[PDB]
Amino acid sequence: MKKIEVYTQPDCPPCVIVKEFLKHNNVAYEEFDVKKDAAARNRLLYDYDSYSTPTVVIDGEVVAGFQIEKLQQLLN
């Protein structure tokens, strides 16, 4: 796992919101598009046990869905 992973897909405004929040905060993330990257899709569903995007993984912690304040907490 990378230290900060962000799972997204197209036509997903909540994903854009999370990403842009992360960017505004100058967070060093890596992003994965689960429609275009099958491995990333498999990690989301079968490693992280998350059914939707956005999902962010922060040093192993899975934050599934739209949870801004939990992200702020976890990031520093």
Author numbering: 1 to 76
From the paper:
The crystal structure of oxidized BC3987 was solved and we have related the results from the phylogenetic analysis to structural features, enabling us to map parts of the protein involved in hydrogen bonds near the active site. The BC3987 wild type and T8A mutant structures were refined to 1.4 and 1.18 Å, respectively. In the wild type structure residues 1–76 and 3–75 are observed in chain A and B, respectively. Due to the insert of one Leu amino acid at position 44 in the BC3987 protein, the α2 helix is positioned slightly closer to the β-sheet layer compared to E. coli NrdH. Additionally, the residues Thr8 and Thr53 in the vicinity of the disulfide bridge are possible hydrogen bond partners for the buried C-terminal cysteine. Contrary to what is seen in the NrdH-redoxins from E. coli and C. ammoniagenes crystal structures the Thr8 residue in BC3987 has a rotamer where the hydroxyl group is pointing away from the buried Cys15 Sγ-atom. This orientation of Thr8 is stabilized by a hydrogen bond to a water molecule (HOH34). The proline residues apply restrictions on the protein backbone, making a rigid frame for the active site cysteines. Both proline residues in the BC3987 active site have the trans-conformation with ω-angles of 177° and 176° for the Pro13 and Pro14, respectively.
